Symmetry: D3
Subunit: 282 residues, 6 copies
């Protein structure tokens, strides 16, 4: 019944990408008003202070994610949190915070696996390491604060771009991965069912990266990758997860207004969030 | 063997949308020439006189739909009519006219249900009430002229946007509705089969609103709604209905050249019309 | 004080171009409402019946232009007429009609000279012969109805595309021509002054073809030609002509919604019409 | 030698426009790095806290502008401030703050005059009243904090859109105004000279609204208005003002990433800022 | 292990289409580098000399295809050839050359069947006759050089546009054809399986025409045709064919940079080529 | 009376830019046919063999420019050569070759000065050093082959982007430079006159880089630079130079189809070439 929205205008890495503008764009797509139209009483908590830029910014990223984690950990139980963002790095904080010390399942819908470590990453970008850090792998400065899930409780969906070392780390941690190959073979409905089954009995945290959507349909993303999910597919996925009645938190990240076309990518993620929260055509 | 084309350059409502230019755009996409290439002897009857604008225009809309109804009712039996348009309001006249007093099935392919009444409509637009009026619900001034079908003989396909009161009216009239949720679950082939079965033994009138197509693919529509049918999907739907051999009339409405990209939306509807009339790749 | 608007949805030639949708697009850009905001009492006379198509259509073009000429000739004196259109062929009727038998000056702002005859025209299109016909040159069937001006009272502005025979006809009729070369040399202000001087003491009829504007700025035109007037230039031209206090009628033709981008070309012509009618920033 | 940059992510009015993302977009266009490349030692002061929205927000706008005014008033003399923004309302604070109690000239380059008051404004938007408030006209709650200039020391350039009451207020306050009509007549060089002369002997504060640029060239603005300055024109203007050696502060406002095309509008304003600060091709 | 790349910058027909720029565009999409990243040792053989233009160019087309055929026939066995191109006419040479006199299966993925002869072709374009010529049908000057396959060993996939005579020729030669109708019914996976089965035990040559992809997704093609394969579909097709381990050669043709959007169509074909060569997400 | 066209499909540098496709694009814009329509007897000499890429490629660039120089030096006197291209590096060969050992004036219309040397170049790209090499400055391997002009006989027009070392080299060689600042002050007509005067009595070689045009108008260029010449401006420049009757050769370089919009940039350069060769509206 209660939903809290918080943004993390973060765009920290080797170079800027423009995703720090994601929260404003999402709010612009009327996420709050539509959540109210749905029947939820909503409160916008504002934004988490984030340093900007002119393993880069690890401490600044760590610092912002920490403020975020602490903020979400303090929300009363029964409050569904929605973290809006730019850099997927924020999920280190949202997942660790929204989990509130319990065992929770993570449904990571991304074109990327974000399972790199300082040793396997070709770019050194922390925003390509959040899920690995959440699983207990990576820089000591990050895992000491955000390690919150067991790789056995993580399901990746829509992945279509992986780094060599990433593949090794995912196989050895044994993370369940549904790449676009699996989507093209099984369809999103069966994959959604397998997701719920693989993580049965667990509260669910959904981390939705805008880039999972095909860039032809959703151009405004931090790192575009060709051939992703259609809008109806991402929708069906959210609907089925919603039906489980087990989703407890959500991240809407990587929106990049600079590359967007009339905020349509921000609008799609807002639409996806509504489905995850039970919005149906009828 | 014989086809008649008539346009209704109507754009009457709270504000203009530009759909009055739909008929010209459709004719521009060579609908007639291609119908001849298909083997049909075609005659363009021209356009129905329509008042323009500088419950708005109910009488003017009613007046144009009346001229249209009378015109189609007068066509010799055996003549397949194709009504080109702007406002979906025209279907009050096309369906009532092309039905010629018989019991006919209505396959309404639209992103909207157009099942509002003066009491449930948030905007007061008559172009959002045609199907309800055809079913016997709404303003006395409209139902007295256009009530032509029983809600049990109506099938809606592709709906993805509904008003609260609309939902009530559709449930209580018991109208069969296949929203995008059903399309994502069953596929258009099975839905097409269920359409034919639900309306078995009846002549079929297909009302195709351009907005049923995803606006990313078909931008030139009166009221765009994200996440609709792909072009191949709408095609398969038309092909299967064509196979029934029971389609007796067709509406091609809501084309909006102002928002279109090189008339591609008008071309898609023309293509859809050809499939409905039996055009196959081979 | 009084203005009358009439449209001629004409697109008759070797092939369609889509300009028959020009009048609706122009009305869509709120020409009437803005003329009222300016202080004029306006009446929209509707559209002139025009045959459509599936020396082509000379008789049909002649027939529509005739209805138009008769219509404008009947307007009370003191009524300023604005003819909206598609094909520039309509000016045969607007100029001959709005002239009301008097001697009037014609300021033709077009990328083309429209001074071809059946003998010099490479395409045979009548919409490339209106100004020549108005000057008494061309097909007997057209000059017998529309010859209304002396070539000495004609000024062409912005021309950048001419056919070999056209050049001969213009030189021998001695028509004053300001091509883009002259605009690049003198500026539109001096050319505007020379226009008023060359036609001093005469009532002025302005025929504005949308294609005079650079197609990068105004893409929605019947026949686009690269490197035309900027929007500010066309504006200044209209302002200076307006200052003369001698403009008595206006044509706004060749708008092509199919190629337009959000009706911006139709909006520009509406804006140009307002300046011609005295609209100033202050 | 010293420059300070501060952003005001403000988008407060009847409805959002998306200009709160202007500061990030501008920083994204590398304003700071390029100012350093120019030879300036730069410090980014960050952003002024601004309330967001879900005579609207007058107090919230007043509150943010107050924090801004106080911030700029505290900068050491010799520090050139550059206020980045969204809503032009911020200039109430930047001008009043950067003036530091002295008599300063205001060069307002905008498509609008922003000279409305609660009595003349058709929309009630405060972002359409900043210059009037700075001149001592408008709501007591605003003039009591931001009145900082005499209308005789204000020069408006590029205006092309005015409200009826605005015209009255500007005439009676006797504000010097160079609309696009004057730009089309005199050229920007002579207007720039007249600006410097009209405000001779005074320190100069330049308030640059992105919408002064033609929207065809710079689409990403809060309120687009057709037919504005070209990029070279705005440049020449900045160069000539730079040559005076009297410019002491600058506002870069109304950037709207949502409507922009690859941040090109933000890049143009950054380019304009460099010229104002002395950047030359050679 | 070894791959050879050769381009055929050919754009010969009734009029130019711009496909001669296809090879450069494809090389631009880093086909070679990515093939190396995959583990292949690659050598770019450069381009086949092709006459340009200012049954047209039959001899010039024949001459270029001959040089190509001879070139590929000379490659050591074990070398996988990839012919980049413009005109699909080149396949007369690539198929005949890469076949090296053996019996090989041809998987032609095209929106067109390219099965016309001088007698059935409405345009006379040789680039619409390559597959027929390869099958032994057409001009003596072409079949005497390129006849290399039996129509029983040819499978067409994705066809959505056919000429009347083409249909006759395909039926009488008994060529297996999977049009978009079959793709909409069976899905690409089952069709891919049926392709492999229909051509079981044979080395496979894949001829991929860029136009098989939906033009909304891949605009840069010689002859665009609405409603084609999605990018994921074409991918799955390549993957399954790759799994057979029987693909021995590949054509990547009809890329048209002039109509492309940032070389995305060339990039898609490069991506498709990688899948055909075994590239997987994991 | 005689014109020879030769292309140099060169795209050699730190990374590819796609300009090797410039010659085909230009030929695609019907340069030859239009030169004939103008009255010239034309012969297309084809393309100069150029190595492609997968101080980079100095020898390969040197080798191609050498073949080009030798080719043009061999043309009969009285033959006007037009070198089409990609990389501006080719001008080392075109200028040195078309000069035929005489003293000739060079009118370099570029957004860049191309006056870098191995010592001042931040990127090491040879395509940013051709004019300096032609003037006798730079790598011994290049000046020994292409030094053909005295810096006193060089005029640069439209420059808007310079490297620090470039500025030094231009000042010390005393090269006449008209940057966009001068164009904004004097206009292109006066600058054109000053060009002819500064190089009076000399045969003229015009080197036209597509990037001199504003990228908003002409996007398809190797290295786009904001705020350049309009199309009419570049035209007037060519017309005035044409009037001198002293132009003896021309380069049309840096066309980049990948970034172009429907080959409009290639069409503009073709149009510019016609004006340089005497094409007038009348």
């Amino acid at each position: 019944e209660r939903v809290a929205v918080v943004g993390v205008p973060m765009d920290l890495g080797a170079n800027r990408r423009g995703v720090d503008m994601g929260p404003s764009a999402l709010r612009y797509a009327r996420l709050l008003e539509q959540l109210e139209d749905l029947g939820y009483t909503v409160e916008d908590l504002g934004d988490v202070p984030v340093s900007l830029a002119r393993l880069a910014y690890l401490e600044e990223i760590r610092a912002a994610a920490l403020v975020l984690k602490e903020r979400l950990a303090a929300l009363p139980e029964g409050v569904f949190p929605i973290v809006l963002g730019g850099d997927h790095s924020l999920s280190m904080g949202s997942v660790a915070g929204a989990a509130r010390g319990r065992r929770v399942g993570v449904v990571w819908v991304d074109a990327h696996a974000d399972f790199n470590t300082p040793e396997t990453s070709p770019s050194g970008n922390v925003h390509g390491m959040p899920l690995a850090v959440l699983s207990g792998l990576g820089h000591p400065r990050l895992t000491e604060v955000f390690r919150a899930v067991d790789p056995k409780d993580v399901v990746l969906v829509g992945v279509r771009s992986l780094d060599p070392g990433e593949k090794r780390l995912l196989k050895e941690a044994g993370v369940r991965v549904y790449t676009m190959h699996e989507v093209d073979r099984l369809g999103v409905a069966r994959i959604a069912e397998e997701v719920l089954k693989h993580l049965q009995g667990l509260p669910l945290h959904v981390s939705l990266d805008a880039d999972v959507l095909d860039p032809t349909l959703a151009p405004g993303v931090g790192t575009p990758v060709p051939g992703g999910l259609t809008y109806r597919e991402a929708h069906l996925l959210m609907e089925i997860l919603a039906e489980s009645g087990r989703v407890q938190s959500l991240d809407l990240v990587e929106v990049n207004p600079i590359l967007d076309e009339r905020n349509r990518t921000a609008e799609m993620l807002v639409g996806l969030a509504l489905s995850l929260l039970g919005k149906r055509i009828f």
